[PDB]
Design a protein around this nucleic acid. Structure first.
Lengths: 100, 46
RNA sequence: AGACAACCUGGCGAACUGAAACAUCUUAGUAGCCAGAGGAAAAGAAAGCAAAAGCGAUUCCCGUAGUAGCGGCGAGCGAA
RNA sequence: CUGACCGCGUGCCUGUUGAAGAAUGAGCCGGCGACUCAUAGGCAGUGGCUUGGUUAAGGGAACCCACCGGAGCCGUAGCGAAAGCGAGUCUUCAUAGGGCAAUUGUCACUGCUUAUGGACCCGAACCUGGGUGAUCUAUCCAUGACCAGGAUGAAGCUUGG
RNA sequence: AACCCAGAGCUAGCUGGUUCUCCCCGAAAUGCGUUGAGGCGCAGCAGUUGACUGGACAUCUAGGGGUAAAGCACUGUUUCGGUGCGGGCCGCGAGAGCGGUACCAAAUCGAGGCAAACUCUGAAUACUAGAUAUGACCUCCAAAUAACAGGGGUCAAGGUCGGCCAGUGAGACGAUGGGGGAUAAGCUUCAUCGUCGAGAGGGAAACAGCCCGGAUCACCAGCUAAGGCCCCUAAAUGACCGCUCAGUGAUAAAGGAGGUAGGGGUGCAGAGACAGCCAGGAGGUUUGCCUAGAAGCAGCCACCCUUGAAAGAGUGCGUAAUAGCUCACUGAUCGAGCGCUCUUGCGCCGAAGAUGAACGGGGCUAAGCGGUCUGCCGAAGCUGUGGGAUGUAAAAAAACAUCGGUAGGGGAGCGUUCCGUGUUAGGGAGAAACGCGUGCGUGAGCCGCGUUGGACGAAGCGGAAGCGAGAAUGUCGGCUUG
RNA sequence: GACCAGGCCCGGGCGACUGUUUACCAAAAACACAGGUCUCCGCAAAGUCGUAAGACCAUGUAUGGGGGCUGACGCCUGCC
RNA sequence: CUAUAACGGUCCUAAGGUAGCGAAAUUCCUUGUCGGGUAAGUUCCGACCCGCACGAAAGGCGUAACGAUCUGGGCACUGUCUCGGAGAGAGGCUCGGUGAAAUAGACAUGUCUGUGAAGAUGCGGACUACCUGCACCUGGACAGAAAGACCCUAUGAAGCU
RNA sequence: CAGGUAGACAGUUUCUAUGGGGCGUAGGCCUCCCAAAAGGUAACGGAGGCGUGCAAAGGUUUCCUCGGGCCGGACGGAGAUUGGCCCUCGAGUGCAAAGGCAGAAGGGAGCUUGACUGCAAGACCCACCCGUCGAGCAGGGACGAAAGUCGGCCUUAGUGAUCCGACGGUGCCGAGUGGAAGGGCCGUCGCUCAACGGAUAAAAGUUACUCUAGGGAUAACAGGCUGAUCUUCCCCAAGAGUUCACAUCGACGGGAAGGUUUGGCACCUCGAUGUCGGCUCUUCGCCACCUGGGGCUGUAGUAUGUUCCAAGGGUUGGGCUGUUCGCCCAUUAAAGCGGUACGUGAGCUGGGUUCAGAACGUCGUGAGACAGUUCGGUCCAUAUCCGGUGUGGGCGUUAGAG
RNA sequence: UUCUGGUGUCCUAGGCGUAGAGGAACCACACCAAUCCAUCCCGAACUUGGUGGUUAAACUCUACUGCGGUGACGAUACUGUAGGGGAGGUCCUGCGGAAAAAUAGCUCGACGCCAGG
């Protein structure tokens, strides 16, 4: 009598938001059709998935007024560090180990 | 009928004591003069 | 010619159960009943096992091995 | 020791989202009454030994046992279904590329837990084998016994035909 | 489908039971699969242990999404008017034509909405990813005097992998966004949080799921939170500003209202008002029709003009209808505050049940509700003083930081019968059951202390268990209640 | 004349009748029965019991035996 | 006349209910209509018929007799009733003797309302009530009795097909 | 020994969800909404599809791109071939929807088989089992002048573990040795195993003759929440009432209280809360039937009709049914509606329903069955306590008594 | 160093309408024939080979706001937290975030690059 209730439950998000770290080969978008087109350093897939070719960063931007045009970049900078806490924790591991 | 009634838990929110006059909600306790400190209370010296 | 605690040999031989049901299988050839006999019985002197090397009638304990294998290749059974 | 009077305080266990519960259970008292053992796998604590650890069955002037008993097991080489090759091997035309390797203890005692056993204790209706049952009752068989008292009045038989 | 004995202590994913102390940590009631959904396997959330770690909290910035809201570009519906295409109808006439109809309808335009499966747009949060700091205390050294930076020592705190092992798998309500239902349920179903579950205490009269709040202990000490200050119960029947007269103050609507304090607009008030007493209050005309009659007053049409201070083809009653009566309107005296209007606050009626006032009671006109300022009460919270315990940690301390807790996990202990040390120490000046000792312990329990009887047996360091009971409609015995 | 000692009619349904049946909640229209039909059996029958010997059947013998349904009596017992 | 169809056409099966009976131990709707009975009768008897779903040896229809059968109306007879009452016996009641029972957490065991696992002597507020016997009634203590027999579940048991 | 063959006899099965069970539907995958702007998400919540198809609808190298309006040309018709203007990707894309795509993934051509072998860093999802994408390398090719693209199809459904068997190919084992049987291994194929994580290769019912273990986790009676329904009300009123809305009835719609009908949930109670109707005995509520007083009346009076205060009282006897306005008879002032676990079974009957027998109609081949009918069918009790009716005793009443 | 077309890339996106200006060079059409080729029919396209006439078309350049695109601030919705009101449907304050819509407006893009006269 109900007839109804047959939903699939599939999942298809954006996997790596703008300005995350893209491994090589990692998937940027798993999509149904082509919302975001491939820009440069990304490859389309069989089912329009968009995956990173080289490590770097993902940049969502319009490739036309309407289109997303996802892209990737090397993005390597900042070697410099400023955190005391990490050094402190490491220092404690050793001091306590020595004490005990 | 056609109007529901308010039961346990539900009854409480309608009918618990609320202090619904902005004024008394506001208030704060007396403070005091700082009461400068007090001596010791014990001494072996004897 | 009757008797027997348990052990033993023979004949007949279940089921609840395990398989999360159940018909192959497992409990199990157990229980029980019948028939003999002994202080022990049954087995036993090779038409055996082996493997290019050797053994040497049976019967038990260890160990190979919970291995090889068998199995609705399931539960499980399991040698030499 | 007893308690004038005041205040606070909706038995206990099981079990539930939720019980003082008008859900369960128990009359009271005292006892009896529930995760045990065997052997094995794994892990931890402790100890012995180690460029190895350990013995089992079996002996031992009983049983325990000092000593003996090295057969056996564990740790030493992997990869492969297998032949095989071996610090490598399988997959392949190939390093290519990848997978897995390129190393480790052991024995025992004491706990935990798993496995097979009735396996924490109590409780079924039931199943199957063997035997005892017809003095009750249900048919039958043999052989006995019983059925007051009255009423009606058939067929046959006999007469007026 | 007998009865007894045996396999048989059958099996039971089902019910009931599971005993001595303390200490630390302490959940879930979700998904998935299941002949599966009042089971079980894995994950998810405990314990405990080993590494590698880096955080967690706050702040800020990026990145994607289409939700809330909005919108009519899309799709689907949607009203009002425009436009007229084209069609039907009258017929003329034996072809389609100009047209006409208060005509039916297709595209369009203007105005106008609506939608979980509509979007040209589109937040806040959430999420993911980055950097940015600094928490709590100390001891300090040098200060006039602080502060802080200067170090040194602590303490507190996140995770991601593993090992050994659990319990859990129908949660409940409240807040929000929703489905189903009847925008009914203390209903059901999911998403994000809180409490209960597993959590005490005070407020709520009583009252898991609401508010404050988190229980290591002692204290015949204090300050507060939520809530409160007339009596029962602690604390002002305390201040001033207002508002209610129903016992409202404790419960429900549409609707009704010259209740009541105010406010927002409106005109009138010596070319004097609403009060009342008053006077006047029409000619055409019986408006035309209809009707027996319609003459203001059955009904309908015209619905004006004249006169004047003023009269509407008459406001109502009434008459067969007329007439009659009276309104509107208009002048005089008395005399200058009265209409209208919507809403604010508190109230009244609407608002009625079955044992007896049900709302804490006594009561109250403030001891009710609206507003501000001061004092107080108020908890197991915070303070003060003094003990205990865990780790942090490895040693005397001392110092911090914690110490609710069911299922459950880990640590440390007591006790009982028996064995090794023993034919022990001790013991007929007397072994154990009963009691005085708040002696002693955090506690399970231990020391002593006594009796008519009266025979055995500790302590210490160790070992084993038929080892700890109020829960099984347990079970054996003795006893009661009725 | 105390004790003892039939209440009776009118109309229905079901069962023809007397009888038997749930020992301890059902005495009935349920079962049975006299009768009816069907069908099987030739005598070392069919049927039943027993693994087998064999025993009922039957020391009977086709108007006799076993089985199924309907249940006096009256008229009947359709079609596929 | 109007109706009801004596009689016809269609798919159908293997054929399409014969005789009797009929709202029936079978008719649901349904106390079906009508007649008799009754003062009034959903029961009852006789009929009609659209037999929801009667029907010919799971026999049809009817029958005299018989029934501790079911069913309706009668006459006689009465405490069945109107509407109770008195009486005798045995118990009850009191005294002497012997002397159980099931149940039982402990009970120092009020009413009304309110609350609460949403129907409390055990909680809150108010009212009410000297303590304790004996006889009497049974509204509560979700009173006793049997781990419900209805409902569901169990990869329960058993019987029959 | 073999084939057939009586449930005569045996051994067993017969699913779960299911806002109680049964009946009905459903069981796997895909897409959209609920899904709360990452993911994920539940409901017998709302819409649909799939269990394929294609030797090309695949692969490449190229070229152009649809529609729906209007205008032209005979029938040609509203809509078919042929030329000119707006266009938002409104066309299509094999089949459902969503996202996509107009240098196209739309259409058409040219050649071709890459819908190859050996693979693969890393990711996504993530209880596991599964599943999805993949830069890049080697061989050997297609297309293309070359760059380059090509290991299936615009993407998401078109599919199912293991065991077992089957076929083709093997420079692997082959139980003394050589063989072989057989097996291994690689490529594959075989189940609407659809209940789609599939208990076996192979299994339906019924129990009212029942029975055990459990459950108020889930029912029926009753209590509670909720009032959809039901009772009683109030608002607006179009009208009707000769005229006249409100003497009286009040269409169309609206707002409430009740808690007793039918229901919804399923919270207590399955180690048990004994049902319908009568008897006896209560007691309470009102929104009132009758008696007491009153308005208004389309009240002459007598009757009334309606409302208002009123629960003090009253509220018959019968015929039919097991059956409270279901009802005819005769009255009567009237002959009420209710609550009290549809009051009252430790007070009573057992006519009904829920026991075992039996039969009728019907369903089922059958055992049996029907919230259809019909005839029969032991409803147990010496009050502990509260409650109530009676009656006492002690004691209080302050000296003791009548 | 302007100008001429040659290619491209950030993007407010860039355009259609009305206007103009462009021929010495460049660009493009009219013209001409046909091997390679090509038109499923056609040199329409595509092709090779010629004439080399206009700027008409197309392109380029400068204006325009009539359309198209764009788009505010403010305010308000809504929402985080902390609370409250209402028998409910749902409403309201405190601190934090904050629009869509409309209107005013804002644009007829900004840079490179090479061969030139």
């Amino acid at each position: 009598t109900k007839n109804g209730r047959d939903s699939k439950g599939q999942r298809l998000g954006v996997k790596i938001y703008g300005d995350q770290v893209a491994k090589p080969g990692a998937i940027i978008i798993r999509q149904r059709g082509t919302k975001f087109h491939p820009g440069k350093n990304v490859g389309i897939g069989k089912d329009h998935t968009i995956f990173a070719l080289i490590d770097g960063l993902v940049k969502f931007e319009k490739y036309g007024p309407d289109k997303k045009k996802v892209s990737v970049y090397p993005r390597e900078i900042q070697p410099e560090n400023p955190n005391s806490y990490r050094a402190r924790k490491r220092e404690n591991f050793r001091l306590q180990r020595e004490k005990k | 009928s056609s109007r529901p009634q308010k039961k346990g838990t539900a009854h409480h929110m309608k009918t618990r004591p609320k202090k619904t006059a902005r004024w008394d909600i506001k208030r704060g306790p007396a403070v005091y003069p700082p009461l400068p400190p007090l001596p010791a209370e014990w001494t072996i010296v004897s």
